[PDB]
With several copies, the nearest count.
Chain A
Amino acid sequence: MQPFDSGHDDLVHDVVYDFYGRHVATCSSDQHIKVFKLDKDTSNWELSDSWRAHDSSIVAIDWASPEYGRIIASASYDKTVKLWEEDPDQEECSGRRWNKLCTLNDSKGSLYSVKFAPAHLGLKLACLGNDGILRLYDALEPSDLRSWTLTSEMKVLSIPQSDFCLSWCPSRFSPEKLAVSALEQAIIYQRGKDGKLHVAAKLPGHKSLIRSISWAPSIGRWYQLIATGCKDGRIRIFKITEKSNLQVELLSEHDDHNGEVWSVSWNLTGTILSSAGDDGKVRLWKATYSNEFKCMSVITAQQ
């Protein structure tokens, strides 16, 4: 496990995996998007392509389900979200191996996050920015991936040192819903019976900026689990059970990091949870028989 050079000039914001974990998408403030592939025989990550995608810092990125094709979405501070699709009729590392499908620019504020909705809800995505407005976009007609409709708008923080996050609920066997974090707030939106979005619940306790929230795959259970990494040094794991209105519990709460917990991610099966922070360490957590989380291992970056 030797590190490789991203090749970015400025700072790298996000790194995201494709469906099979054989590819990775990267975005930096150098206004470039890079895509790497894990060569099967060499087992070394190599550059598939890189290109100038935005006119400002490209903060968030994400892949769409293989089911719809090779599609990547990027959010930038230039108040825009762009959609790209791998055109295999172009050499790799040709700068033109990915084509812009379109540019959604309804946002009037820099964009902080962009996540694709679970494939089982169609080609749908959501983004959040400065304007504290959540926005859902749908490729209503997968026949033509260029036309995306603005499916929804919601004032997450109707009244604006800030951060924003998004994370849909993966489970195909559960009512469409996604989690949103704006500053210190963390609210959940659920698709109402009327087709619109509604604030179904809130994750309380955050004493400062929520740096990262990840909704865990619920393969095997009935309740939902969504973790958050706050600037106040705590990892929090919320248990959302719907009995209908959502019931919210605070399963675990960890401060092991002593400092901002910048990134929280989940396993493929939602069996393992990861946290990273100032302390320059990454901790992994599994759940016990009573559902409290224990830390199973700690990877350091220090020295």
Chain B
Amino acid sequence: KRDPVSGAILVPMTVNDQPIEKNGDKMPLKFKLGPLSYQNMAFITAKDKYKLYPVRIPRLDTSKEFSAYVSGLFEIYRDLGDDRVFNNSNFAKEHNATVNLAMEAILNELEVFIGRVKDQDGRVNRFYELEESLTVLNCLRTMYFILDGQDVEENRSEFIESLLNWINRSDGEPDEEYIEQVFSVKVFETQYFWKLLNQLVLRGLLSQAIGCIERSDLLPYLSDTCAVSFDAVSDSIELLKQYPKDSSSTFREWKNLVLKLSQAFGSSATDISGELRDYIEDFLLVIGGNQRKILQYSRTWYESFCGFLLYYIPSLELSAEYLQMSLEANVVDITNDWEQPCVDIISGKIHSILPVMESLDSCTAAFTAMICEAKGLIENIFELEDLFSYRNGMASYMLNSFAFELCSLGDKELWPVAIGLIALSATGTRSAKKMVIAELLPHYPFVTNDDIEWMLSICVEWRLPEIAKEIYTTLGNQML
């Protein structure tokens, strides 16, 4: 329900009360941004145009789900203590451990948010943007917050489990709706079946894969027609039922049995169709890892990628080579904002994922950069006195940005999270942080006394007593 052209989101002021007619004279439209993000104002200095138009900033999030999400991410932030930054020799090993954990913490907070947004039925637009974010993070996690510069051999189960998650959560496909479009209205012999079967295999959806076979041609056409291939197709199904997800060793042995099986069938009695014959050799080749064939039955670059890792060679040493083969086969779909940021992850350049995420959600983007700086994937290179620029890290920037943004949100519950981010900012002079708070604080939306205390307590903690002169000088004039 939103559309960009000039890179900007174009939107209507009012749905059935827009004051300007394209035929009409050119008019003096005026707009004042308000202290409250959700409360701005547009008006016109012209005759018979005396209506005031309260406007709210496009894509603003006032939801409770969000302020919960923000609070939740702020915990994970201050809880990383010193691990928020990047410097026993296990200091390295333990750092990574507590960080790769905060990453799982984030993914959770976000999955929870996503889930809650799904239940209320406001703009589907926000739910979509958020899910894309999660997918991008799901990729980021798999590629950098599991093996810590190691190889899939170090932690196979965590990796493969995470990889399969990212893949089968990016796009709903193959959606069960399509699976049953391949069954209704001679005898599942057209590619549609195999393309779907191999597709499930490439995606690691073996559970489902075996299910599709056990729905048609296995027990009848085979068991009756050719006995040679019946065995092949069945004890291959058996091999799927036991695809090694934990042991890197069991895999090697596994792939051996897979290849041994295809070699046997490959040169044997063909008592079945000339076509059905090949369809099964292609099925057996995909499982074996034949790149040629993996690319063939791949509908998207990422199914190619997932498959190479799952069946060919599980080593991120070929990640770059895998990506290229996969992209030649099927280019990147620019429809969805997530596919590219993932190609960027898998290929190294991680900074170029931020802008995109800052677009989907300023919040998630800020903390994503934060965790990336913690992990040491991105770092400042830079070389009066305040910093809210490219000067300190990129992550610093986004966090302070999101901080500032929170101040106009009008949610007093998030004001601590705001001042907090500025306080705990990995970089930036203490006096720099002082000045910033000196100006942002007068704007705290205090209601209760407790609030005024928290408020004043910060003037103390930062030596902004002069800011308290004003808190009082005001308090005196408020009653009056």
Contact = CB atoms under 8 A, between A and B. Distances in A.
Is A in direct contact with B (CB under 8 Å) within the complex? yes
Interface in B54-87: 54-59
Interface stretch (A72-80, A107-115, A129-137, A267-275): A267-275
Contacts of B265: 204
Contacts of B47: 10-11
A159 interface: no
A118 B22 CA distance: 40
A243 B260 CA distance: 12
Interface string B461-480: 00000000010011001101
Nearest to B390: A289
Contact of A11 (B50, B53, B259, B405): B50
B14 A2 contact: yes
A1 B400 CA distance: 29
B31 A21 contact: no
A268 B57 CA distance: 13
Given A252-B292, A301-B42, A263 B318 contact: no
B18 A301 contact: yes
Given A173-B438, A204-B263, A290-B312, A250 B285 contact: yes
B52 A172 contact: no
Given A21-B35, A298-B9, A201 B51 contact: no
A202 B36 contact: no
A153 interface: no
A257 to B, nearest CB: 10
Nearest to B48: A11
Contacts of B42: 276, 282, 299, 301
Contact of B405 (A6, A12, A271, A276): A271
B431 to A, nearest CB: 10
Contact of B45 (A9, A11, A272, A296): A11
Contact of B13 (A68, A267, A282): A282
Nearest to A19: B35
A102 B45 CA distance: 27
Interface string A4-42: 111111111111110111101010100000001010000
B29 A281 contact: yes
A148 B440 CA distance: 29
Nearest to B47: A11
A149 B253 CA distance: 41
A220 interface: yes
Contacts of B33: 265-268, 272, 274, 284
Given A26-B52, A269-B405, A272-B33, A295 B7 contact: yes
Specify which of B36, B387, B404, B440 lies most central, judged by the most chain A CB atoms within 10 Å of its CB: B404
A217 B480 CA distance: 29
B32 A3 contact: no
Interface residues of A, number: 95
Interface in B1-59: 6-14, 17-22, 26-36, 39-47, 49-59
B20 A201 contact: no
Nearest to B359: A296
Nearest to B267: A204
Interface string B389-405: 11000100100110011
Contacts of A283: 8
A300 B12 contact: yes
Nearest to A68: B477
A292 B10 contact: no
A294 B7 contact: yes
B436 interface: yes
A260 to B, nearest CB: 8
A248 to B, nearest CB: 5
9 contacts: A1-B56, A68-B477, A217-B439, A268-B408, A284-B57, A289-B321, A295-B8, A297-B8, A299-B42
Given A3-B53, A12-B52, A263-B31, 11 more contacts: A17-B34, A21-B410, A66-B474, A201-B263, A205-B281, A221-B387, A265-B31, A274-B32, A282-B42, A290-B321, A300-B12
Interface of B: 6-14, 17-22, 26-36, 39-47, 49-59, 256, 259-260, 262-263, 265-267, 281, 285, 288-292, 308, 312-313, 318, 320-322, 325, 384-390, 394, 397, 400-401, 404-405, 407-408, 410, 435-436, 438-440, 443, 445, 470, 473-474, 477-478, 480
Chain A to chain B: the 7 pairs with minimum beta-carbon distance, closest first = A204-B266, A220-B388, A21-B35, A278-B26, A263-B30, A280-B20, A21-B36
Interface of A: 1-17, 19-22, 24, 26, 28, 36, 38, 45, 66-69, 88, 119, 171-174, 185, 201-202, 204-205, 217-222, 243, 245, 247-253, 256, 259-260, 262-263, 265-269, 271-272, 274-284, 288-292, 294-303
